[PDB]
Write an enzyme that holds these catalytic residues in place. Sequence first.
Site, short mmCIF file in Angstrom:
data_model
loop_
_atom_site.label_atom_id
_atom_site.label_comp_id
_atom_site.label_asym_id
_atom_site.label_seq_id
_atom_site.Cartn_x
_atom_site.Cartn_y
_atom_site.Cartn_z
N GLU A 194 5.75 2.11 11.04
CA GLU A 194 5.15 1.25 10.03
C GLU A 194 4.60 0.02 10.74
O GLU A 194 5.34 -0.68 11.45
CB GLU A 194 6.18 0.84 8.97
CG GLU A 194 5.66 -0.13 7.92
CD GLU A 194 6.53 -0.18 6.67
OE1 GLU A 194 7.57 0.52 6.62
OE2 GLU A 194 6.19 -0.93 5.74
N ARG A 195 3.30 -0.23 10.56
CA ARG A 195 2.58 -1.35 11.18
C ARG A 195 2.47 -1.23 12.70
O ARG A 195 3.05 -0.33 13.32
CB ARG A 195 3.20 -2.70 10.78
CG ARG A 195 2.83 -3.17 9.38
CD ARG A 195 1.42 -3.72 9.25
NE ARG A 195 1.16 -4.27 7.92
CZ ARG A 195 -0.03 -4.24 7.32
NH1 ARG A 195 -1.07 -3.69 7.93
NH2 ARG A 195 -0.17 -4.76 6.11
N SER A 222 0.83 -1.20 0.00
CA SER A 222 0.00 0.00 0.00
C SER A 222 0.86 1.26 0.00
O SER A 222 0.36 2.37 -0.16
CB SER A 222 -0.97 0.00 1.19
OG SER A 222 -0.27 0.12 2.42
N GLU A 268 7.04 -13.40 -1.35
CA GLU A 268 5.68 -12.95 -1.68
C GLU A 268 5.26 -13.30 -3.11
O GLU A 268 4.23 -12.82 -3.58
CB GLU A 268 5.55 -11.45 -1.43
CG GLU A 268 5.60 -11.04 0.03
CD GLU A 268 5.75 -9.55 0.24
OE1 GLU A 268 5.71 -8.78 -0.75
OE2 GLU A 268 5.91 -9.13 1.40
C1 LIG Z 1 2.31 -7.20 9.96
C2 LIG Z 1 2.30 -8.56 9.31
C3 LIG Z 1 2.87 -8.76 8.06
N1 LIG Z 1 2.84 -9.98 7.50
C4 LIG Z 1 3.48 -10.21 6.19
C5 LIG Z 1 2.67 -9.71 5.00
C6 LIG Z 1 3.73 -9.19 4.05
O1 LIG Z 1 4.12 -10.22 3.14
C7 LIG Z 1 4.93 -8.85 4.91
C8 LIG Z 1 5.09 -7.35 5.19
O2 LIG Z 1 3.90 -6.64 4.81
P1 LIG Z 1 3.51 -5.24 5.49
O3 LIG Z 1 3.54 -5.40 6.99
O4 LIG Z 1 2.26 -4.74 4.82
O5 LIG Z 1 4.75 -4.29 5.09
P2 LIG Z 1 5.11 -3.85 3.58
O6 LIG Z 1 6.46 -3.20 3.64
O7 LIG Z 1 4.91 -5.02 2.64
O8 LIG Z 1 3.99 -2.73 3.27
P3 LIG Z 1 4.24 -1.51 2.25
O9 LIG Z 1 4.56 -2.19 0.94
O10 LIG Z 1 2.93 -0.75 2.25
O11 LIG Z 1 5.39 -0.74 2.85
O12 LIG Z 1 4.75 -9.55 6.15
C9 LIG Z 1 2.27 -11.04 8.14
O13 LIG Z 1 2.26 -12.17 7.59
N2 LIG Z 1 1.70 -10.92 9.35
C10 LIG Z 1 1.68 -9.74 9.98
O14 LIG Z 1 1.14 -9.64 11.10
MG LIG Z 2 7.05 -1.59 3.70
#
Ligand SMILES: Cc1cn([C@H]2C[C@H](O)[C@@H](COP(=O)(O)OP(=O)(O)OP(=O)(O)O)O2)c(=O)[nH]c1=O
Ligand SMILES: [Mg+2]
Lengths: 198, 198
Positions: free
Chosen positions: A93-94, A20, A161
Amino acid sequence: TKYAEGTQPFTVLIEGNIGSGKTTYLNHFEKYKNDICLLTDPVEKWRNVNGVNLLELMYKDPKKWAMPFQSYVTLTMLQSHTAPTNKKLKIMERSIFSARYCFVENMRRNGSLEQGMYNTLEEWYKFIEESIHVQADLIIYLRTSPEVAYERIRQRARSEESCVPLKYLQELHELHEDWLIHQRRPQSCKVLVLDADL
Amino acid sequence: TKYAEGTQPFTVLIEGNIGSGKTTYLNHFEKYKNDICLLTDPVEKWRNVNGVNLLELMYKDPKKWAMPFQSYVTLTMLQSHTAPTNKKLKIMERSIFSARYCFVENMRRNGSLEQGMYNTLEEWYKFIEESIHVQADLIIYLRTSPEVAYERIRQRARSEESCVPLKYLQELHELHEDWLIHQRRPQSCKVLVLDADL
Ligand SMILES: Cc1cn([C@H]2C[C@H](O)[C@@H](COP(=O)(O)OP(=O)(O)OP(=O)(O)O)O2)c(=O)[nH]c1=O
Ligand SMILES: [Mg+2]
Ligand SMILES: Cc1cn([C@H]2C[C@H](O)[C@@H](COP(=O)(O)OP(=O)(O)OP(=O)(O)O)O2)c(=O)[nH]c1=O
Ligand SMILES: [Mg+2]
């Protein structure tokens, strides 16, 4: 009398789906490094725990690894939530809240976490709520459509991913809506919605 | 500034192998219920988490369930360690220390916990040590031989413990020795050794 109570400034939590643009948004505050405490991309911790890639193991074998992975996610969020700072602002973040209400919940729904594992995690969350102070003043919700979220994940191309389907992101999006807009989950915090479709 | 700091009295921890008579020993302090805080047999919590038998699942499928089970064991110990009391003495069956140094360690050794799971748990223990106060003044070590320990487990006849081999109890006994007598683990506390072979 909770841990880290009274030692935390105004805390902003950056939330939204995978891909996002949470890190991209936080990268704009980079000039004020010495003024704002910036804790970005906690995913890097999960990809490398003393050489072990927990994120990869979770995606490869959810039935076995979703539990320890979410447990570690919770821990790192907690360590960031309670990290010491002399700065007047902290942007994160998060948070522990998205880990619980979005990811743990969806892994319960899809069968990655068995009931006993979900329950263990939930009982941990309840105890953390009374033992450890989690500062949360404002949440900026970077709202995206699952299709655009999928686009960004493809462009970043994290090997872990690479198997994530759109169905998974649709589920997580709706849970983000339930928690941050529809208020189906218990959270007393101010939310600012943003159209993160550029 | 840790959780439950300064709210705990003199705390005694009752330790020893499975079937060493920890509950039997604590049952002697039963007359002074209103004088001493007595928290016995935390195993009953693990056998029934909202109807789920985590102990049974751990013994049936260690590779999948040892991680969530030990996570829950840690939680219940923490909830007992920090439980509020107006009494001048608290005696506890088991502790967070035995869960870590004896059981988690042996499950790492026998392959029940994969490296990533062991590491997740270890990082939790390190954070707990900085966030949550664990009162520990005296540990009574009910010392048994693995053979006598096996005898008591058979007489109690917990259906979950029906497949526990003597090899397992021999491993746990030596780890109890390492921790409480040989000091092979980074720890320092008062220990009273007792011959619990009746
Ligand atoms: C916070 C969290 C992430 N995840 C995973 C989902 C994602 O593959 C990875 C991190 O995702 P995100 O926590 O959404 O971080 P991001 O860096 O991908 O988001 P953005 O691109 O907006 O900066 O970890 C979990 O499986 N469980 C959790 O509780
Ligand atoms: Mg990120
Ligand atoms: C404390 C602990 C117990 N267990 C298991 C081992 C046993 O099967 C069960 C309970 O063991 P114990 O904790 O030794 O409790 P007990 O009631 O059997 O002890 P005693 O007979 O001396 O009163 O839980 C773990 O798997 N991990 C742990 O960290
Ligand atoms: Mg007992």
